[PDB]
Design an enzyme around this catalytic site. Structure first.
Site, PDB file in Angstrom:
ATOM      1  N   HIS A   1       0.859  -1.184   0.000  1.00 21.96           N
ATOM      2  CA  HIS A   1       0.000   0.000   0.000  1.00 21.96           C
ATOM      3  C   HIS A   1       0.896   1.234   0.000  1.00 21.96           C
ATOM      4  O   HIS A   1       2.110   1.095   0.112  1.00 21.96           O
ATOM      5  CB  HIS A   1      -0.921   0.036   1.234  1.00 21.96           C
ATOM      6  CG  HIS A   1      -0.159   0.082   2.520  1.00 21.96           C
ATOM      7  ND1 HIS A   1       0.311  -1.038   3.134  1.00 21.96           N
ATOM      8  CD2 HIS A   1       0.378   1.129   3.196  1.00 21.96           C
ATOM      9  CE1 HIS A   1       1.052  -0.692   4.170  1.00 21.96           C
ATOM     10  NE2 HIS A   1       1.135   0.638   4.233  1.00 21.96           N
TER      11      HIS A   1
ATOM     12  N   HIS B   1       1.249   5.635   1.201  1.00 18.31           N
ATOM     13  CA  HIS B   1       0.874   6.844   1.962  1.00 18.31           C
ATOM     14  C   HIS B   1       1.215   8.030   1.069  1.00 18.31           C
ATOM     15  O   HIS B   1       2.282   8.000   0.429  1.00 18.31           O
ATOM     16  CB  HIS B   1       1.603   6.933   3.302  1.00 18.31           C
ATOM     17  CG  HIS B   1       1.482   5.714   4.152  1.00 18.31           C
ATOM     18  ND1 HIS B   1       0.559   5.634   5.191  1.00 18.31           N
ATOM     19  CD2 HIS B   1       2.104   4.529   4.095  1.00 18.31           C
ATOM     20  CE1 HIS B   1       0.654   4.421   5.743  1.00 18.31           C
ATOM     21  NE2 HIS B   1       1.594   3.729   5.087  1.00 18.31           N
TER      22      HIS B   1
ATOM     23  N   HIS C   1       4.839   0.848   0.891  1.00 21.40           N
ATOM     24  CA  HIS C   1       5.162  -0.152   1.933  1.00 21.40           C
ATOM     25  C   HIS C   1       4.817  -1.520   1.397  1.00 21.40           C
ATOM     26  O   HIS C   1       3.637  -1.807   1.143  1.00 21.40           O
ATOM     27  CB  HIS C   1       4.376   0.145   3.217  1.00 21.40           C
ATOM     28  CG  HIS C   1       4.894   1.320   3.932  1.00 21.40           C
ATOM     29  ND1 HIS C   1       4.142   2.000   4.903  1.00 21.40           N
ATOM     30  CD2 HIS C   1       6.041   2.008   3.784  1.00 21.40           C
ATOM     31  CE1 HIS C   1       4.862   3.021   5.300  1.00 21.40           C
ATOM     32  NE2 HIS C   1       6.019   3.061   4.670  1.00 21.40           N
TER      33      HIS C   1
END
Ligand SMILES: [N]S(=O)(=O)[C][C][C]C1234B567B89%10B5%11%12B5%13%14B%15%16%17B8%18(B961B%18%152B5%163B%11%1374)C%10%12%14%17
Ligand SMILES: [Zn+2]
Length: 258
Positions: free
Chosen positions: A92, A94, A117
């Protein structure tokens, strides 16, 4: 009134439901490049993603997760600072509202536009739920994103986001090859830390790559069209889903490179 990234439920509130938020090995951190010591005992990272089997992409209301079949030793991380074998379960990102913020880790206080990540669990604990209860349960490979040239290997992810705009939407997402998201160099920093979302468990060996990947302004703008809210709810754009740097406390960041 669940956790999220807002004024009333964001990172400065998390400690009320998750007291480990003020713990001794929280993530992310600022990487002070002058203080990080070269450790000649660290091994090259072994990233074995040739047999990685992606299954699905999910909008969980915080980010989007690309999920893998982890029912066998297909996609594994080993070497570097690690003992034994860690299985890829998901990745995923950010990201920010603007290109000047979005990363969780910082480098001499520099914020990147986003951070990828890739999450892996230690096969010696059998399942990820047992692994997160252990100090060496997870290994997360972090990769910075900067805005410039497009990343061709990311475009398949960008193009499916229209189909998972809102919280709780998923889409079949087979045959995605995460090798297309890696930079040229596997030089890294490493330190012991935590999940950066609740439950904030202190179960992670962090491996942060020095070399960022470049993505285009158009690619990251499509991340910023996602929604934190569910279908038919008032629109809250999915932006600024990053935790700020936490106190380093009694920890040393090690570099794999001179
Ligand atoms: N920003 S971060 O710390 O990598 C968030 C990691 C969140 C999870 B925890 B569990 B363990 B694996 B799956 B699910 B949650 B999901 B992934 B790691 C599983
Ligand atoms: Zn993350």
């Amino acid at each position: 009134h669940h956790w999220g990234y807002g004024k009333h439920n964001g990172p400065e509130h998390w400690h009320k439901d998750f007291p480990i938020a003020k713990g001794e090995r929280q993530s992310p951190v600022d990487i002070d490049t002058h203080t990080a010591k070269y450790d000649p005992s660290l091994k090259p990272l072994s990233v074995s993603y040739d047999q990685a089997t992606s299954l699905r992409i999910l909008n969980n209301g915080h980010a989007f997760n690309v999920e893998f079949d982890d029912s066998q030793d297909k996609a594994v991380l080993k070497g570097g600072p690690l003992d034994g074998t860690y299985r890829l379960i998901q990745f995923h990102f950010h990201w920010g509202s603007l290109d000047g913020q979005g990363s969780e880790h910082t480098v001499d206080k520099k914020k990147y536009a986003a951070e990828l990540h890739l999450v892996h669990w230690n096969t010696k604990y059998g399942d990820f739920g047992k692994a997160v209860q252990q100090p060496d349960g997870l290994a997360v490979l972090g990769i910075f994103l900067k805005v410039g040239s497009a990343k061709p290997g990311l475009q398949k992810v960008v193009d499916v986001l229209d189909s998972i705009k809102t919280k709780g939407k998923s889409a079949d997402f087979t045959n995605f090859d995460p090798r297309g998201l890696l930079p040229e160099s596997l030089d890294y920093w490493t330190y012991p830390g935590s999940l950066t979302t609740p439950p904030l468990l202190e179960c992670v060996t962090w491996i942060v790559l020095k070399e960022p990947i470049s993505v285009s302004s158009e690619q990251v703008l499509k991340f910023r069209k996602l929604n934190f809210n569910g279908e038919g709810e008032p629109e809250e754009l999915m932006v600024d889903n990053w935790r700020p740097a936490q106190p380093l406390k009694n920890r040393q960041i090690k570099a794999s490179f001179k």
